Amino acid sequence: VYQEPTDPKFPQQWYLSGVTQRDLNVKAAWAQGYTGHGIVVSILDDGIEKNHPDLAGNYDPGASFDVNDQDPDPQPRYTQMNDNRHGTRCAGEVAAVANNGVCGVGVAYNARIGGVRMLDGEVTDAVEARSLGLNPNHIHIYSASWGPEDDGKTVDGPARLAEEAFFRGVSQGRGGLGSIFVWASGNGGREHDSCNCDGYTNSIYTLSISSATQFGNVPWYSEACSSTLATTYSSGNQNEKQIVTTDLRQKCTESHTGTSASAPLAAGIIALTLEANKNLTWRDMQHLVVQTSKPAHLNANDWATNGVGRKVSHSYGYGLLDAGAMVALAQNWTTVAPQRKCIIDILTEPKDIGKRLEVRKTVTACLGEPNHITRLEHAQARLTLSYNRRGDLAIHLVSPMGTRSTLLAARPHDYSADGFNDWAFMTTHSWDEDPSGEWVLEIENTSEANNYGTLTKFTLVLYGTA
Ligand SMILES: [Ca+2]
Ligand SMILES: [Ca+2]
Ligand SMILES: [Ca+2]
Ligand code: NA
């Protein structure tokens, strides 16, 4: 009985609905009656053309602000090069108006869309915090298609205020259910960057999203890491189609690309999911993604089955998001139990790394205590170590159930001698596994060079329930 969009460009939005069973299954969600009505999404970027003909109808001033110039109007700054078109492109993917004879449609075409202009100027910790913490009781989902430079040699993440914003967000946002923070995993594929060296994507508070090309391949710009949760389609080679969305100066583009285009699609799907169940907590949402994402059709060299029978890849997380499945499961979802946190400091003495180091430890996961965990969610391996050439290292963490998460792959451009200072490598690959038993940390020098260093701290942090 449902009638799909009549927008001129909808037919080119192959990732929304296609006759090749290779899409995000969004129409199936629309058919179930979910379009994002009542949900508020904010694009933290370089601004949003609120008067765009395909955005005006859904624009929401309450979900917007201009942090760069300190005013409530997020309108982009116009320049000959059209530098500030990025946010507007991301906004359209989420909530471009449907059936209005203009361009295409957003995943959640009935959602309210806002924008925080915060990338067009000096991006400080304060700027980030004010953006991430904007109207936490009005805005439901925040979408961020930006982050530290992807040079493949830096390790960076949120400073204190931003961290506090994230924490206040998942704790108090949405009336206590927790703000949903969607993040683009990065464009450093060519520089061999790792998204675990990015504190925004690596955070447990954000749903880090990767990309897949139309033919189901890992895009050239893709960054692999264990912190990524799932994937949505984006651009690839010139024979593959790209993302169709709203563009600056009230135009329509068919060439929105890279990691930037994936997060917004995920944000939209999540918007449909919240409409299906407004009581989902920020953790419930991550559970739904893990459970409903599909690996099938996606090509990767590292698909592996984890302790609970789910396929995972460092390039895709649990696979392609499935809107229809997300909204279906949301309806019968029982809120998960309170989050427990079990801290296990492993080292009793510094360990020399040399060519290879292996650290084994049998844990009880806080058995007999209030934070006993039998069903894992995120896991972090907080490491502190020194090394002469950081990029030559590769670090892996194996769960008692045999799931091997690569916390860090070699980064050839990383010649840093500063090592890692209590860096919290995170993995989503052992989600739902029982964490008790022997864990193994492996650190290896992937180069033939005679490198040296010392691992001074290894704290295993488990989040989950019983
Ligand atoms: Ca302004
Ligand atoms: Ca439209
Ligand atoms: Ca990166
Ligand atoms: Na994350």
Coordinates of C-alpha atoms and ligand atoms in Angstrom, one line a residue:
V1 CA 0.0 0.0 0.0
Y2 CA 3.0 2.3 0.6
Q3 CA 3.9 4.8 -2.2
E4 CA 7.6 5.5 -2.7
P5 CA 9.2 8.9 -3.5
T6 CA 8.5 10.7 -6.8
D7 CA 11.5 13.1 -6.4
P8 CA 13.4 13.4 -9.8
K9 CA 16.7 12.0 -8.4
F10 CA 15.3 9.2 -6.2
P11 CA 15.9 6.6 -8.9
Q12 CA 19.6 7.5 -8.7
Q13 CA 19.7 7.0 -5.0
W14 CA 20.7 3.3 -5.6
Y15 CA 21.9 2.9 -1.9
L16 CA 18.4 3.6 -0.6
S17 CA 16.5 1.2 -2.8
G18 CA 17.6 -0.9 -5.7
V19 CA 16.7 -3.8 -8.0
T20 CA 19.9 -5.7 -7.1
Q21 CA 19.4 -6.5 -3.4
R22 CA 22.5 -4.4 -2.8
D23 CA 21.2 -1.5 -0.8
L24 CA 20.5 -0.3 2.7
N25 CA 17.0 -1.6 2.7
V26 CA 15.5 1.8 3.6
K27 CA 12.3 1.4 1.5
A28 CA 11.4 -1.6 3.7
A29 CA 11.5 0.7 6.7
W30 CA 9.4 3.4 5.0
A31 CA 6.9 0.7 4.1
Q32 CA 6.7 -0.4 7.8
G33 CA 5.7 3.2 8.4
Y34 CA 8.9 4.8 9.6
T35 CA 10.2 8.1 8.1
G36 CA 11.8 9.8 11.0
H37 CA 8.8 11.8 12.1
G38 CA 9.3 13.4 15.5
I39 CA 13.1 12.8 15.5
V40 CA 15.7 15.6 15.6
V41 CA 19.1 15.2 14.0
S42 CA 21.9 17.8 14.0
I43 CA 24.8 17.9 11.5
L44 CA 27.9 19.2 13.2
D45 CA 29.8 20.6 10.2
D46 CA 30.6 23.7 8.2
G47 CA 27.0 25.0 8.2
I48 CA 23.7 24.2 6.7
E49 CA 21.9 26.0 3.9
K50 CA 18.6 26.2 5.8
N51 CA 16.8 27.9 2.9
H52 CA 17.7 25.1 0.5
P53 CA 14.5 24.0 -1.3
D54 CA 15.1 20.4 -0.3
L55 CA 15.9 21.2 3.3
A56 CA 13.7 24.2 4.3
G57 CA 10.6 22.1 4.9
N58 CA 12.4 20.0 7.6
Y59 CA 14.8 22.7 8.9
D60 CA 14.8 23.0 12.7
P61 CA 16.4 26.2 14.3
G62 CA 16.3 24.5 17.7
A63 CA 18.8 21.9 16.4
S64 CA 21.0 24.6 15.0
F65 CA 23.6 27.1 16.0
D66 CA 26.7 28.9 14.6
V67 CA 29.5 28.3 17.0
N68 CA 32.1 29.7 14.7
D69 CA 30.6 33.3 14.7
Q70 CA 28.6 32.9 17.9
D71 CA 25.0 33.4 16.6
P72 CA 22.0 31.1 16.1
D73 CA 22.1 31.2 12.3
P74 CA 24.1 28.2 10.8
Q75 CA 24.0 29.5 7.2
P76 CA 27.2 28.6 5.3
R77 CA 29.8 31.2 4.4
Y78 CA 29.7 31.5 0.6
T79 CA 33.0 31.5 -1.3
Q80 CA 34.0 31.1 -5.0
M81 CA 35.4 27.7 -4.3
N82 CA 32.3 26.6 -2.4
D83 CA 34.4 25.5 0.6
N84 CA 31.4 25.3 2.9
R85 CA 29.1 23.0 0.9
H86 CA 30.0 19.9 3.0
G87 CA 27.5 20.2 5.8
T88 CA 24.7 20.9 3.4
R89 CA 25.5 17.8 1.5
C90 CA 25.5 15.7 4.7
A91 CA 22.2 17.3 5.8
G92 CA 20.4 16.2 2.6
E93 CA 21.4 12.6 3.0
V94 CA 19.6 12.5 6.3
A95 CA 16.5 14.6 5.8
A96 CA 16.0 16.0 2.3
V97 CA 12.3 16.6 1.7
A98 CA 10.4 13.9 -0.2
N99 CA 7.8 14.2 -3.0
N100 CA 8.5 17.8 -3.7
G101 CA 9.9 17.6 -7.2
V102 CA 13.3 18.6 -6.0
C103 CA 16.5 16.5 -6.1
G104 CA 16.2 13.3 -4.1
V105 CA 15.1 12.3 -0.6
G106 CA 16.7 11.8 2.8
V107 CA 16.8 8.5 4.6
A108 CA 14.5 10.0 7.3
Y109 CA 12.6 12.5 5.1
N110 CA 10.2 13.4 7.8
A111 CA 12.8 14.1 10.5
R112 CA 13.7 17.6 11.7
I113 CA 17.1 18.6 10.6
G114 CA 19.5 21.1 12.1
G115 CA 23.0 22.2 11.6
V116 CA 25.8 23.5 13.8
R117 CA 28.3 25.6 12.0
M118 CA 31.6 24.7 13.7
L119 CA 34.2 23.6 11.1
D120 CA 34.5 27.0 9.4
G121 CA 37.0 28.6 11.8
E122 CA 39.4 27.6 14.5
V123 CA 38.1 24.2 15.8
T124 CA 38.9 24.2 19.5
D125 CA 38.0 21.9 22.4
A126 CA 35.4 24.5 23.4
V127 CA 34.0 24.7 19.9
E128 CA 33.6 20.9 19.8
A129 CA 32.1 20.7 23.3
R130 CA 29.5 23.4 22.6
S131 CA 28.5 21.6 19.4
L132 CA 28.3 18.1 20.9
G133 CA 26.4 19.5 23.9
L134 CA 24.0 21.6 21.9
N135 CA 20.4 21.2 23.2
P136 CA 20.8 17.6 24.5
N137 CA 17.1 17.4 25.4
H138 CA 15.9 18.5 22.0
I139 CA 18.4 16.9 19.6
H140 CA 18.3 13.1 19.5
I141 CA 21.1 12.4 17.1
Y142 CA 24.4 14.2 16.3
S143 CA 26.2 13.4 13.0
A144 CA 29.9 14.2 12.6
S145 CA 31.7 13.8 9.3
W146 CA 35.0 15.3 10.5
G147 CA 37.9 14.5 12.8
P148 CA 41.7 14.7 13.3
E149 CA 43.7 14.9 10.1
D150 CA 44.2 11.5 8.4
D151 CA 47.9 11.7 7.8
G152 CA 48.5 8.2 9.1
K153 CA 51.0 9.4 11.6
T154 CA 49.1 11.2 14.3
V155 CA 47.3 10.0 17.4
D156 CA 44.6 12.5 18.4
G157 CA 41.2 12.6 20.0
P158 CA 38.8 14.9 22.0
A159 CA 40.3 17.2 24.6
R160 CA 38.6 17.5 28.1
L161 CA 35.5 19.6 27.4
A162 CA 34.6 17.5 24.4
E163 CA 35.1 14.3 26.4
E164 CA 32.8 15.8 29.1
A165 CA 30.3 16.7 26.4
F166 CA 30.3 13.1 25.2
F167 CA 29.8 11.8 28.8
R168 CA 27.1 14.3 29.7
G169 CA 25.5 13.4 26.4
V170 CA 25.2 9.6 26.9
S171 CA 24.3 10.1 30.5
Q172 CA 21.8 12.9 30.5
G173 CA 21.0 13.5 26.8
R174 CA 17.5 12.6 25.6
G175 CA 16.0 12.6 29.0
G176 CA 18.6 10.1 30.3
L177 CA 18.4 7.7 27.4
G178 CA 21.6 9.2 26.0
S179 CA 22.5 11.3 22.9
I180 CA 23.3 9.2 19.8
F181 CA 26.7 10.3 18.4
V182 CA 27.3 9.0 14.8
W183 CA 30.9 9.4 13.4
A184 CA 32.6 9.0 10.0
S185 CA 35.5 6.5 10.5
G186 CA 38.0 8.5 8.3
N187 CA 39.5 9.0 4.9
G188 CA 43.1 8.0 5.6
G189 CA 43.1 4.7 3.6
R190 CA 45.7 5.9 1.2
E191 CA 48.0 7.0 4.1
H192 CA 47.4 3.6 5.8
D193 CA 45.7 5.4 8.7
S194 CA 44.0 3.5 11.5
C195 CA 40.7 4.6 13.0
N196 CA 41.8 3.4 16.4
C197 CA 44.3 6.3 16.4
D198 CA 41.3 8.6 16.4
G199 CA 39.8 9.2 19.8
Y200 CA 36.4 10.2 18.4
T201 CA 35.8 7.1 16.4
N202 CA 37.5 4.9 19.0
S203 CA 35.2 6.1 21.7
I204 CA 32.5 3.8 23.0
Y205 CA 30.1 6.7 23.0
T206 CA 30.1 7.1 19.2
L207 CA 28.9 4.7 16.5
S208 CA 31.8 4.8 14.1
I209 CA 30.7 4.1 10.5
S210 CA 32.8 2.9 7.6
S211 CA 32.1 2.8 3.8
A212 CA 31.5 0.3 1.0
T213 CA 31.6 1.0 -2.7
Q214 CA 28.7 0.2 -4.9
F215 CA 30.2 -3.1 -6.0
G216 CA 30.8 -4.1 -2.4
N217 CA 34.4 -3.3 -2.1
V218 CA 36.6 -1.5 0.5
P219 CA 37.0 2.1 -0.8
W220 CA 40.5 3.4 -1.4
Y221 CA 40.0 6.0 1.4
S222 CA 38.8 3.5 4.0
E223 CA 40.5 3.1 7.3
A224 CA 40.5 -0.3 9.1
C225 CA 40.4 -0.8 12.8
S226 CA 38.5 -2.8 15.5
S227 CA 36.5 0.2 16.9
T228 CA 34.3 0.5 13.8
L229 CA 30.8 -0.7 14.4
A230 CA 29.1 -0.9 11.0
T231 CA 29.0 0.3 7.4
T232 CA 26.9 2.3 4.9
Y233 CA 27.5 2.8 1.1
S234 CA 29.5 5.6 -0.3
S235 CA 31.8 6.3 -3.3
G236 CA 34.4 4.1 -5.0
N237 CA 35.9 4.1 -8.5
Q238 CA 34.6 6.0 -11.5
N239 CA 32.4 3.1 -12.7
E240 CA 30.6 3.1 -9.4
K241 CA 27.9 5.6 -8.5
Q242 CA 28.1 8.1 -5.7
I243 CA 25.8 9.8 -3.2
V244 CA 23.0 12.1 -4.4
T245 CA 22.1 14.9 -2.1
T246 CA 21.5 18.7 -1.6
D247 CA 24.3 21.0 -2.5
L248 CA 25.3 24.6 -1.7
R249 CA 23.5 27.4 -3.7
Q250 CA 20.3 25.4 -3.8
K251 CA 21.7 22.8 -6.1
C252 CA 21.6 19.1 -6.3
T253 CA 24.7 16.9 -6.5
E254 CA 25.3 13.3 -7.5
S255 CA 28.9 13.3 -6.4
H256 CA 29.0 13.5 -2.6
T257 CA 31.9 11.1 -1.6
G258 CA 34.1 9.5 0.9
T259 CA 33.7 8.7 4.6
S260 CA 31.7 11.9 4.9
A261 CA 28.7 10.4 3.1
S262 CA 28.5 7.3 5.2
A263 CA 27.8 8.7 8.7
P264 CA 24.8 10.8 7.6
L265 CA 23.1 7.7 6.1
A266 CA 23.7 5.9 9.3
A267 CA 22.3 8.8 11.2
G268 CA 19.2 8.7 9.1
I269 CA 18.6 5.0 9.6
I270 CA 19.1 5.5 13.3
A271 CA 16.4 8.2 13.1
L272 CA 14.0 5.8 11.6
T273 CA 14.9 3.3 14.4
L274 CA 14.2 5.8 17.2
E275 CA 10.8 6.6 15.6
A276 CA 10.1 2.9 15.8
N277 CA 11.1 2.9 19.5
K278 CA 11.7 6.3 21.2
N279 CA 12.8 4.5 24.5
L280 CA 16.0 3.0 23.1
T281 CA 19.1 4.0 25.0
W282 CA 22.4 4.9 23.4
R283 CA 23.5 1.3 24.3
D284 CA 20.3 -0.3 22.9
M285 CA 21.0 1.4 19.6
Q286 CA 24.5 -0.1 19.4
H287 CA 23.1 -3.5 20.2
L288 CA 20.5 -3.2 17.3
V289 CA 23.3 -2.3 14.9
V290 CA 25.5 -5.3 15.9
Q291 CA 22.5 -7.6 15.6
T292 CA 21.0 -6.5 12.3
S293 CA 24.0 -5.5 10.2
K294 CA 24.6 -7.7 7.2
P295 CA 28.1 -8.8 6.0
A296 CA 26.8 -10.5 2.9
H297 CA 27.8 -9.0 -0.4
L298 CA 30.7 -7.0 1.1
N299 CA 34.1 -8.2 0.0
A300 CA 36.9 -8.1 2.6
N301 CA 40.1 -10.1 3.2
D302 CA 39.5 -10.3 6.9
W303 CA 36.0 -11.5 7.6
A304 CA 36.1 -13.7 10.7
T305 CA 33.5 -15.3 12.9
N306 CA 33.6 -14.2 16.5
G307 CA 32.7 -16.1 19.7
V308 CA 29.0 -15.8 19.1
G309 CA 28.9 -16.7 15.4
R310 CA 28.8 -13.2 13.9
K311 CA 31.1 -12.2 11.1
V312 CA 33.3 -9.1 11.6
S313 CA 35.8 -7.2 9.5
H314 CA 38.1 -4.4 10.5
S315 CA 37.0 -2.6 7.3
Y316 CA 33.3 -2.9 7.9
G317 CA 32.6 -3.8 11.6
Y318 CA 29.5 -6.0 11.5
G319 CA 28.6 -5.1 8.0
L320 CA 26.1 -3.1 6.0
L321 CA 23.3 -1.4 8.0
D322 CA 19.8 -2.8 7.3
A323 CA 17.1 -0.2 7.9
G324 CA 14.2 -2.6 7.6
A325 CA 15.8 -5.0 10.1
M326 CA 16.7 -2.1 12.4
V327 CA 13.1 -0.8 12.7
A328 CA 11.7 -4.3 12.9
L329 CA 13.9 -5.4 15.8
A330 CA 13.5 -2.0 17.5
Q331 CA 9.8 -2.6 18.1
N332 CA 10.2 -5.7 20.2
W333 CA 13.4 -4.6 21.9
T334 CA 13.7 -4.9 25.7
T335 CA 16.0 -2.2 27.1
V336 CA 19.4 -3.7 28.1
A337 CA 20.5 -4.0 31.7
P338 CA 22.5 -1.3 33.4
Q339 CA 26.1 -0.9 32.0
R340 CA 28.8 -2.6 34.1
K341 CA 32.5 -1.8 34.0
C342 CA 35.2 -4.2 35.0
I343 CA 38.8 -2.9 35.2
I344 CA 41.7 -5.4 35.1
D345 CA 45.2 -4.1 35.4
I346 CA 47.4 -6.8 33.8
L347 CA 51.1 -6.0 34.2
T348 CA 53.1 -6.8 37.3
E349 CA 56.3 -5.4 35.7
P350 CA 57.4 -3.6 32.6
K351 CA 57.8 -5.8 29.5
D352 CA 60.4 -5.4 26.8
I353 CA 58.9 -5.5 23.4
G354 CA 61.8 -6.3 21.1
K355 CA 60.7 -8.2 18.0
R356 CA 57.5 -9.6 19.5
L357 CA 55.8 -9.6 22.9
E358 CA 53.0 -11.8 24.0
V359 CA 51.1 -11.2 27.2
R360 CA 48.6 -13.7 28.6
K361 CA 46.2 -13.3 31.4
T362 CA 43.3 -15.4 32.6
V363 CA 40.5 -13.1 34.0
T364 CA 37.3 -13.7 35.9
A365 CA 35.7 -10.6 34.6
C366 CA 34.8 -9.4 38.1
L367 CA 33.1 -12.6 39.1
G368 CA 31.4 -12.3 42.5
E369 CA 31.3 -8.5 42.3
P370 CA 28.6 -6.0 41.3
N371 CA 30.4 -5.4 38.0
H372 CA 30.6 -9.1 37.0
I373 CA 30.3 -9.3 33.2
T374 CA 29.1 -12.4 31.3
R375 CA 28.0 -10.5 28.2
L376 CA 30.5 -8.1 26.7
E377 CA 29.8 -4.9 24.9
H378 CA 32.9 -2.7 24.2
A379 CA 36.4 -3.7 25.4
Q380 CA 39.4 -1.4 25.7
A381 CA 43.1 -2.3 26.0
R382 CA 44.6 0.8 27.6
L383 CA 48.3 0.8 26.7
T384 CA 51.3 2.8 27.8
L385 CA 54.5 2.0 26.0
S386 CA 57.7 3.5 24.5
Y387 CA 59.0 2.6 21.1
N388 CA 61.5 4.1 18.6
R389 CA 59.3 3.9 15.5
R390 CA 55.6 3.8 16.4
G391 CA 54.3 2.9 12.9
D392 CA 56.2 -0.4 12.8
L393 CA 54.1 -1.8 15.5
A394 CA 51.0 -4.0 15.0
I395 CA 49.0 -4.9 18.1
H396 CA 46.4 -7.6 18.5
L397 CA 44.1 -8.6 21.3
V398 CA 42.6 -12.1 21.4
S399 CA 39.5 -12.8 23.5
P400 CA 39.0 -16.0 25.5
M401 CA 36.6 -17.2 22.8
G402 CA 39.2 -16.8 20.2
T403 CA 38.2 -13.5 18.6
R404 CA 41.3 -11.7 17.3
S405 CA 40.9 -7.9 17.3
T406 CA 43.7 -5.9 15.6
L407 CA 44.0 -2.8 17.8
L408 CA 46.7 -1.3 15.6
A409 CA 48.0 -2.2 12.1
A410 CA 51.3 -1.0 10.9
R411 CA 51.3 2.7 9.8
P412 CA 54.3 3.2 7.5
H413 CA 54.2 7.0 7.8
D414 CA 54.2 7.0 11.6
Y415 CA 57.8 7.6 12.6
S416 CA 56.9 9.0 16.0
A417 CA 59.1 8.1 18.9
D418 CA 56.5 9.2 21.5
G419 CA 54.8 5.8 21.8
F420 CA 51.4 5.5 23.4
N421 CA 50.4 7.2 26.7
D422 CA 47.5 5.4 28.2
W423 CA 45.8 5.1 24.8
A424 CA 42.5 3.2 25.0
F425 CA 42.4 1.0 21.9
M426 CA 38.8 -0.2 21.6
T427 CA 37.2 -3.2 19.9
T428 CA 33.6 -4.1 19.1
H429 CA 34.4 -7.5 17.8
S430 CA 33.8 -9.5 20.9
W431 CA 30.3 -8.0 21.5
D432 CA 28.1 -10.5 23.4
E433 CA 31.0 -12.9 24.1
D434 CA 31.7 -14.1 27.6
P435 CA 34.9 -12.3 28.6
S436 CA 36.1 -14.6 31.3
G437 CA 39.1 -16.8 30.5
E438 CA 42.4 -16.1 28.9
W439 CA 43.0 -12.9 26.9
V440 CA 46.2 -12.5 24.9
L441 CA 47.8 -9.2 23.8
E442 CA 50.3 -9.4 20.9
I443 CA 52.7 -6.7 20.0
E444 CA 55.0 -7.2 17.0
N445 CA 57.6 -5.3 15.1
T446 CA 56.4 -5.6 11.5
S447 CA 59.6 -4.2 10.2
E448 CA 63.0 -5.8 9.7
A449 CA 64.6 -2.9 11.5
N450 CA 66.1 -3.4 15.0
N451 CA 63.4 -1.5 16.9
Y452 CA 63.2 -1.3 20.7
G453 CA 60.7 -0.3 23.4
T454 CA 58.9 -1.2 26.6
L455 CA 55.3 -1.9 27.5
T456 CA 54.8 -0.3 30.9
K457 CA 51.0 -0.6 31.3
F458 CA 48.2 -2.8 30.0
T459 CA 44.8 -2.3 31.5
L460 CA 41.9 -4.4 30.2
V461 CA 38.6 -2.6 30.5
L462 CA 35.4 -4.5 29.9
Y463 CA 31.9 -3.0 29.6
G464 CA 28.8 -5.1 29.6
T465 CA 26.1 -6.9 31.5
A466 CA 25.2 -10.1 33.3
Ligands
CA1 CA 25.9 32.9 11.4
CA2 CA 13.3 16.2 -2.6
CA3 CA 42.0 8.6 10.6
NA4 NA 33.1 4.7 18.5

